[PDB]
Amino acid sequence: LDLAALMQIGVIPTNVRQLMYYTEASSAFIVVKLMPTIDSPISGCNITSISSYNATVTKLLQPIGENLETIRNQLIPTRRRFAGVVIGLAALGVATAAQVTAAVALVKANENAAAILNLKNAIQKTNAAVADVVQATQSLGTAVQAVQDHINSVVSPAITAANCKAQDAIIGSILNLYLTELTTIFHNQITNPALSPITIQALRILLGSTLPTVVEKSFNTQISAAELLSSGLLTGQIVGLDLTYMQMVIKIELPTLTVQPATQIIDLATISAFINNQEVMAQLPTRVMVTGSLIQAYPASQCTITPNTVYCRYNDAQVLSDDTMACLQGNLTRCTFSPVVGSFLTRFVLFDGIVYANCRSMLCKCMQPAAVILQPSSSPVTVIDMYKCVSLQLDNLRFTITQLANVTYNSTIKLESSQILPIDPLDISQNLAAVNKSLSDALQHLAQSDTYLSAIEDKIEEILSKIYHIENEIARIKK
Amino acid sequence: LDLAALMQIGVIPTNVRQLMYYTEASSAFIVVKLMPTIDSPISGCNITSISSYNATVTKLLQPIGENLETIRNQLIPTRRRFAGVVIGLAALGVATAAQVTAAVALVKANENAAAILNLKNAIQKTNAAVADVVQATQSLGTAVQAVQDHINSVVSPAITAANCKAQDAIIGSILNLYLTELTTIFHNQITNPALSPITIQALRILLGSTLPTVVEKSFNTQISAAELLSSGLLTGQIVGLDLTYMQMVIKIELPTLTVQPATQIIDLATISAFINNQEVMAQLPTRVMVTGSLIQAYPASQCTITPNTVYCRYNDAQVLSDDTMACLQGNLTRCTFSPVVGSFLTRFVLFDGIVYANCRSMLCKCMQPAAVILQPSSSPVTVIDMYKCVSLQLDNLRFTITQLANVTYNSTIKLESSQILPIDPLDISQNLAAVNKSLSDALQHLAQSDTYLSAIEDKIEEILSKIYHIENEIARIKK
Amino acid sequence: LDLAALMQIGVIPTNVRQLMYYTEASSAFIVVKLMPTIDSPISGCNITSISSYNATVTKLLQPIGENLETIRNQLIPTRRRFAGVVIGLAALGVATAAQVTAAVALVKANENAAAILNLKNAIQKTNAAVADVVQATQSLGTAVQAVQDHINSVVSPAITAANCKAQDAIIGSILNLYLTELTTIFHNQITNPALSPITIQALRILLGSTLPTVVEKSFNTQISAAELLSSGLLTGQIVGLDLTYMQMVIKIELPTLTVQPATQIIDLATISAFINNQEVMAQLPTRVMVTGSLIQAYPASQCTITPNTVYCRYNDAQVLSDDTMACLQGNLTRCTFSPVVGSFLTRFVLFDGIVYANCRSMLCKCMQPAAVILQPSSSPVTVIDMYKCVSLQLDNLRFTITQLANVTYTIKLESSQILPIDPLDISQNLAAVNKSLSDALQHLAQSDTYLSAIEDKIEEILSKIYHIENEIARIKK
């Protein structure tokens, strides 16, 4: 990966990050009370809010239920503890690898799950936003209720036949709002929805304001709850669910990471360059992975990026074409360019105190000393340090330079207009039909250059006939 | 379609679904009072909240309002109805067919909107989050107020002039929130904003806590309320507005669906294959429609998906090349592929108990009877069933296999490297540049082959004069 | 740009808009009181929610604070003679143009940021939702606090020991919810996270319910709050921060838009046309920018759009191919078409009263005069005006057309103009052409052979002559 040489067609390494992989996945358990608890006593009042919200979050979770059920019915992990073997995966119908992985993790968590739903009665009757779940002075985990705090702060100490409508109103408000938010993250599309991942998004919905407390509680680490809540390291799998109690057990995994050595992930941005009288930019991957002499396109989409680090749980590398590699590795005659409509924002960056600009599409005016800086055609973009200028101006934006670049250049860079391609499907599809046309010109041309041959070969046959007759009439002369 | 064939190249049918079209909707009329009622008595103070709120909400609706007004005037103007034909669509300006359908729908509801809006004052001074609406035995619709119960549970049954500023500041903290939620869904960008459909996303902001209630009573249907709230089947269109009263009549529709016969919607996954010493993936549409001898690409990205069913009001079929068409219909030699960087997640898939995997790129370690499973280059993917393995170890995954695969075979498929194409545009472009260099070099070739053709016409002339002068010195010999 | 020719193949200009260029900004200052003030007396009770909130939030801001101070220490404007010339930019490291713009912005607002931050003690002790910030009878900015009101509505008049539990509960439940939101908009992936623009989405979260009120307070203009809040005009930058007090200074900017002359942003949509037994669709930019003789693709994706006007901070202009430029300018034989499975939805539009449709694909049933409209092969689309049909029916729709043609204008289009645009079908084609180039290469290499032979024949000639030149030479006597 030759960066030095790549900066001479505007290709700027914005930041260099270290790649991360997971050694083991630290875990914790979570019970979600879907129904809030009442401490107030109810008399001569049928609170209609609840017999409905019950029915509906029950309907909403009926798939995840029947699936947790069908699977647990046909898991059967032989011995498990220690290392066992899962039996009868055909129960999943068709499944992907990530789905099968989760199918087995469901089976392991089975125990800790049942251990938790064992105590559903306690958990239900307990009134808290965030309670501990205890058995034998050990914690099986945390149980949460996203609205309880809010319920507590609003019901009458006593529900009477006077309070009825007014209570069943504002309970309904709170209930039906949380029910609307559950109706996003719980649409059922697929065949084994129990196995579906719970995003850090779906989690913020389920736990509500309880989330920060649970993150501080469920995991202990050098990681701050700040960066832990903010990134997307956290993930969950539904591992247990009782409908009648509306309690839903969720395994939550925080992966322990470590550097993968001799690998870097480098983001590439491109300023505009001036080459063969067009304003273009390099056509390269915006971020690649580099291990030794290997290079691939590394878009970290779902992945967790930080100033010095990328954690990809997954791996979505794309392969790089032969020119593209060549391009990245020094041979600039294989870099591919494309016309762009430059702009101030896209026509220069700033690198450790030095200016890499396209000083031709854009005006580079030096202040000390003041001389409009012209960019030669043998230079696609322009480097600017202390020597070329101690005080730059650019439009309204002005600054000084203390920085000096290590020479390390030695001109020049020759690139043919054939390195300037369409990158657009339509543009390309057009350039293709053109070549096809040209090729049909060369086909009709051949068929025509083959009628000439048939001619010429036939004129040679006449010359042979003439020659057989002369040479024979010479034999006729025997004297 | 030949799903059997495709499997042998890593192409897996994940879902098969009925396709459902819409043969008529059921509708409900909601009215949204954006201004909640304040029953409690005042004393010598102005509630600044309701001031800036009346102002700011009213101005936000102005485009929707002015446009509602125009169309209603120019299409069917205080004439005696209707039904049948709509007049003067020129008022729309430039309209899409959806916008034209909306317009007819608006003037078709004109009367029922008018009916509900007669009672604007009864409604507006009624204190209910969810208010029924009836006209002397005639069910007209349903009034709703989004923040009603959250102001019911804060209002001090009397407002002094000393507790004024203090209760102003907390009505204008809730009013301002529900306001901020409104500034999102009500931009004005297009020419006829009153025709823009209301999405379920938008209905959730407008109706807030009231939505599941509305959904429950608005439609008498078999479909659950959990389904409706969570799906996408719900859509709305504004049919009436009154800025003074800040009420908005919204019509809400629920499509009645029927299964489209002899059609299925098929999802196709690709695991990676090993072909001509490469790891690749087949390049095909990930979801397709199939009916009779037909096959179209059907990415139902905006449609509603359940496990058996795909409802699509919007029919967006992509049409397929004859190459792809032949690939899916059986002829594997026409298929295309592209290089990929396999991961554990993409190298396999489990299919009714039977593993399909790239046992080249990935180690298929069979545990009992212990063996590395090898994958002959003849086979692009391996089919693991009871015979090849009984208990399989794919990294952390250990699991039995007890079934036998259907014997449609044999492994006699040969695949050209001319079948491994690029799909990234940048690559496809480079490849085109390379074909064009190659045509340009086959054009310099026929040029030179035309130069020889001229040079030989020269020689064979110069030969023809030699034979003359020769024939003549023969004639010249008379003795 | 021949729009009227374009319409003949179903290319419809559905919007015509002005374009606005950024001129100046209107700067306003905000201070987010992150920590709400609590007037209730506490007695023998450690409200734990505060200290967790206080800590968790302080950690969350570590990057922005550091990167704030790092730049303030290193940058310094401070010029001399006589412009806004700046020193020491190597503190930003590798940073893009737009962020260097943000850094000089950051370094101008020093004096005013530090002036506001001098009043920090006063601000933190003032229990107010929205609240002005003054020094020497001068309004410097507004001091907001997203939860102050909700707090006040629920915290008990005096916090006792029989109180603590329900009280620490309800207060954490406010503090945490707001804290959770804080984490969706604060996450450093990048080098200098203090120059990261603050979206309108961020403000709605960062200021909560104070946002409407604080927007009318800070901006004198003819754009109302409705417009101001509904659009993407509102941008913010972080210009200061005190971690001890949990107060963050934010500079809102509201642009000043002036019309760009001779420039227009036209939206092109496409109905489906019938061309050579094929249902197809012109392949054009959905959106373009036209200054007289010039045409660029202008799909304004991150720009504010009103029915008459379009504003962008910078440009998303892309350069058009020559064929499409030719197609846009009236040469219909330079157009590119691809096949589609059109719907009722893409088979017609309405243009100021007149119906432009595909009466081949879709049934254009005419209710008066009661006949079916058939579309000729010469015609890609049909133009139905009042003369064609006064009363139309398209599926379930029935309407009238009373407006009149304005004919003005036929065009012949080659099946070759139909191409794929989906990178796969293109790639399969590029292969099929390479396979043909191989036929031409073999045909060249094979005629290469009929040329070395046939040059063997002339060498036979040359010799067979030389030998009848031996005779005829020795036949001299």
Domain ranges of chain A: 1-22+261-342+407-421, 23-260, 343-406, 422-479
- With CB atoms and an 8 Å threshold, state whether B436 touches A435: yes
Q: Do C444 and B446 touch (CB under 8 A)?
A: yes
Test the B interface: residue of A48, A56, A467 with most B CBs within 10 Å: A56
Q: For domain B422-479, give its CATH number from 3.30.160.60, 3.20.20.80, 3.40.50.2000, 3.40.50.20.
A: 3.30.160.60
A217-249 residues labelled b (16+ CB within 10 A) or e (exposed): bbbeeebbbbbbbbbbbbbbbbbbbbeebbbbb
- Rounded distance between C-alpha atoms, residue C465 and residue C468, angstroms: 5
The Cα C462–Cα C454 span in angstroms is 12
Question: Is the separation of the CB atoms in A169 and B149 below 8 Å?
Answer: yes
Closest alpha carbon to A394 in A342, A352, A357: A357
Give the residue carrying structure tokens 């509602």: B68
Contacts of A52 in chain B (CB under 8 A): 216
Q: How many CB atoms lie within 10 A of CB B309?
A: 14
Q: How far is the alpha carbon of C88 from chain A, nearest alpha carbon, in Å?
A: 7
Name the residue with tokens 């709170």. Answer: A174
The three-state secondary structure class of C194 is coil
Q: CA A414 to CA A334: how far, in whole Å?
A: 11
Edge-to-edge, what's the strand order for the sheet holding B382-384? A94-96, B348-351, B354-357, B382-384
Four-CA torsion A335, A340, A344, A349, nearest 10 degrees: -10
Reported in sequence order, the residue ranges of A159-313 that DSSP labels E, i.e. its strands, are: 197-198, 235-242, 247-270, 273-275, 278-282, 287-291, 294-297, 304-306, 309-311
For residues B437 and A418, is the Cβ–Cβ distance under 8 A? Answer: yes
Per the structure block, which two tokens stand in for C98?
Answer: 């737009």
> Which fold does the domain C420-477 belong to in CATH?
Double Stranded RNA Binding Domain (3.30.160)
For residue B474, the tally of other CB atoms under 10 A from its CB is: 16
DSSP C245-302: TTEEEEEEEEEEEEEPTTEEEEEEEE--EE-SS-EEEE---SEEEEETTEEEE---SS
Structure-token pair, residue A381: 């973009």
Q: Where are the alpha helices (DSSP H) in C162-279?
A: 164-185, 200-206, 210-218, 225-230
Task: Determine the distance in angstroms separating the CA of C167 from the nearest CA of chain A, rounded to an integer.
Answer: 9
The H or E element that residue B430 is part of is helix B425-475
Q: Residue B403: which of B390, B413, B394 has the closest Cα?
A: B390
Report the C-alpha gap between C321 and C335 in whole angstroms. 11
- CB within 8 Å: C454 and B456: yes
**Phi-psi label, residue A408: left if phi above 0, alpha if psi -120 to 50, beta otherwise:** left
DSSP symbols for A81-124: SSS--B--GGGGSEEEHHHHHHHHHHHHHHHHHHHHHTTHHHHH
* Residue A27: strand pairing partners: A253
Q: Smallest CA–CA separation between B3 and chain A, in Å?
A: 14
Do you know the residue count of chain C? Answer: 477
Q: Which residues of B touch A177 (CB under 8 A)?
A: 208-209
The residue length of chain A stands at 479
Which of B85, B179, B439 is closest, CB to CB, to C400? Answer: B85
Among C303, C316, C319, C414, the residue to mutate for chain A (most A Cβ within 10 A): C319
Among C216, C340, C475, select the one facing B319 at the smallest CB separation: C340
State the Cα–Cα distance between residues A254 and A236, nearest whole angstrom: 9
Report d(CA C97, CA B358) in Å as an integer.
47
Give chains near B: 3+ CB pairs under 8 A.
A, C
Report the C-alpha gap between C241 and A145 in whole angstroms.
35
Listed in sequence order, the residues at least 6 apart from C117 whose beta carbon sits closer than 8 Å to its beta carbon are C240, C242, C247, C249
- Comparing CB atoms, the residue among A305, A352, A391 nearest residue C93 is A352
Contact C437 B439 (CB under 8 A): yes
Question: How many Cβ pairs within 8 Å bridge chains B and C?
Answer: 204
Task: Please choose, from the candidates C64, C49, C56, C77, the residue with its C-alpha nearest in 3D space to the C-alpha of residue C248.
Answer: C64
Which two tokens mark C457? 């024949």
Q: Are A29 and A220 in contact (CB under 8 A)?
A: no
Mutate to test the interface with A, among B148, B209, B385 (most CBs of A within 10 A): B209
**A318: chain B residues, CB-CB within 8 Å:** 340-341, 424
Q: How many residues does chain B have?
A: 479
In chain A, residues with a C-beta closer than 8 Å to the C-beta of C416 are: 433, 437
**CA B430 to CA A321: how far, in whole Å?**
9
- Which of chain A's residues have a Cβ under 8 Å away from the Cβ of C187? 227, 230-231
β-partners of residue C269 are C12
Measured between CA atoms, the residue of chain C closest to residue A338 is C319
Q: How far A354 CA lies from chain C's nearest CA (Å)? A: 7
Say how many C-beta atoms besides its own lie within 10 A of residue A427's C-beta: 24
- Cβ–Cβ gap C472/B470 under 8 Å: yes
Q: Please tell me if the domain spanning A1-22+261-342+407-421 has the same topology as the one spanning A343-406.
A: no
From C348, which residue of chain B is nearest by alpha-carbon distance?
B97
Contact criterion met (CB < 8 Å) for B429 and A422: yes
Under an 8 A CB cutoff, do A307 and C63 touch? yes
Tokens for A207, please give them: 């736990």
Closest approach of A59 to chain B, Cα-based (Å): 6
Q: How far is CA C5 from the centre of its chain?
A: 29
Helix (H, G, I), strand (E, B) or coil at C89: helix
Smallest Cα–Cα separation from C317: which of C345, C283, C289, C353?
C289
Cβ neighbours around C450 below 10 Å, total:
15
CATH superfamily entry for domain B1-22+261-342+407-421: Newcastle disease virus like domain (2.40.490.10)
C307 and B190: CB-CB below 8 Å? yes
Distances (CA, A) of C421 to A100, B289, C281: 37, 20, 11
Alpha-carbon span A340 to A343, nearest angstrom: 9
Cα-based angle A316, A321, A322 (whole degrees, multiple of 5): 140
For residue B10, give how far its alpha carbon lies from the nearest alpha carbon of chain A (Å).
12
CATH topology of domain C343-406: Immunoglobulin-like (2.60.40)
Q: Which two tokens stand for residue C212?
A: 């409407």
Min Cα–Cα distance to chain C from A225, Å: 7
Q: How was this structure determined?
A: X-ray
Q: Per the CB < 8 Å rule, is B324 touching C420?
A: no
Instruction: Give the residue from B207, B351, B394, B399 with the most A CB atoms within 10 Å of its CB, the best one to mutate.
Output: B399
Picking from B339, B354, B433, the nearest residue to A421 by CB comes out as B433
Name which of B397, B438, B448, B466 to mutate to probe chain A: the one with the most chain A Cβ atoms within 10 A of its Cβ.
B397
Residues of B in contact with C286 (CB under 8 A): none
Interatomic CA distance for residues C167 and C157, integer angstroms = 11
Task: Assign domain C1-22+261-342+407-419 to its CATH architecture.
Answer: Beta Barrel (2.40)
A partners (3+ CB pairs within 8 A) are B, C
Give A36's DSSP letter. Answer: P
Quick one: CA torsion of C427, C433, C439, C441, rounded to 10 degrees?
A: -90
The C-alpha R_g of chain A, in whole angstroms, comes to: 36
Pair B64, B238: CB distance under 8 Å: yes
Nearest by CB to C166, from A152, A227, A341: name it: A152
Cis omega (within 30 of 0) for bond into A82 = yes
Q: What letter would DSSP give residue A308?
A: T
CB contact under 8 A, B341 and A84: no
Nearest beta carbon to residue B399 from set A85, A170, A452: A85
Taking the C-alpha atoms of residue B174 and residue B152, their distance in angstroms, rounded to an integer, is 12
Distances (CA, A) of A92 to A89, A114, B301: 6, 22, 25
Minimum distance, in Å, between the CA of residue B348 and any CA atom of chain A: 6
Contact A191 B307 (CB under 8 A): yes
How far are the Cα atoms of A137, A356, C129, C144 from residue B48, in angstroms, in the given order?
55, 54, 14, 18
In a mutational test of the B interface, the residue from C272, C350, C421 whose CB has the highest number of chain B CBs within 10 Å is C350
HEC profile of B98-122:
HHHHHHHHHHHHHHHHHHHHHCHHH
Inspect the interface and report whether the beta carbons of B350 and A439 lie closer than 8 Å.
Answer: no
Look at B350 and A89 and tell me if their CB atoms are within 8 Å.
yes
> Following CA atoms B83, B85, B91, B93 in sequence, which dihedral angle do they give, to the nearest 10 degrees?
130
What secondary structure letter does DSSP report for A326?
H
Chain C hits for B319, CB-CB cut-off 8 Å, are: 339-341
Q: Which chain A residues are closer than 8 Å to C188 by Cβ?
A: 306-307
Burial class, C21, CB count within 10 angstroms (exposed 0-12 / middle 13-18 / buried 19+): middle
Residues 6+ apart with CB under 8 A from B150: A170, A173, B174
Smallest CA–CA distance, residue B68 to chain A, in Å, is 30
